[PDB]
Design a protein around this ligand. Structure first.
Ligand code: HEM
Length: 146
């Protein structure tokens, strides 16, 4: 499944091929997708809500929260940008290695959260083993500054 520790996995030509088949259908509605992913994460993991100073209101207005939607799309886009550069595995490493640093020293986020949001991301878009490896690479790197 999704992993967040250990030797970085390598994306096969096959994995990359499969991912690029499912992806467009997803970003064809990145707004309705990015939202459900973030909303299901906060509903099933309410304790994670305290990590976003940008918001901490009553969950009754959490789907209209403009800032909620803004963070939703921010995540979806990074994932998109990582898929756009799957071939150059040196670029991905450099990029996500630095983002891990922001989350640690700047946003003061707990590393145990990435895998969980990642689990919901995949399930919502229905990605297979391919996407689990992608997010395995994503989560391992996001926890590298820790
Ligand atoms: C799939 C994994 C994730 C990706 C791809 C991702 C990506 C990003 C990106 C692109 C930013 C923008 C940073 C900047 O502008 O310099 C960000 C900020 C942030 N992320 Fe994540 N993130 C992920 C998971 C999480 C999780 C699980 C949490 C914690 C519950 C988290 C908490 C934050 C916070 C609090 C900020 C600061 C937002 C702000 O104040 O504007 N992230 N993230």
């Amino acid at each position: 499944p999704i992993i967040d520790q250990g030797p970085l996995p390598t994306l096969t030509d096959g994995d990359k091929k499969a991912i690029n088949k499912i992806w467009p259908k997803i970003y064809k509605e990145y707004e309705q997708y990015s939202l459900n992913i973030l909303l299901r994460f906060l509903k099933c993991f309410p304790q994670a809500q305290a990590s976003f100073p940008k918001f901490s209101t009553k969950k009754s207005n959490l789907e209209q929260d403009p800032e909620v939607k803004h963070q939703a799309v921010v995540i979806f886009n990074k994932v998109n940008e990582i898929i756009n550069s799957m071939d150059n595995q040196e670029e991905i490493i450099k990029s996500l290695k630095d983002l891990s640093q922001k989350h640690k020293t700047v946003f003061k986020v707990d590393s145990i959260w990435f895998k969980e949001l990642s689990s919901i991301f995949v399930s919502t878009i229905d990605g297979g083993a391919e996407f689990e490896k992608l997010f395995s690479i994503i989560c391992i790197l996001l926890r590298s500054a820790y």
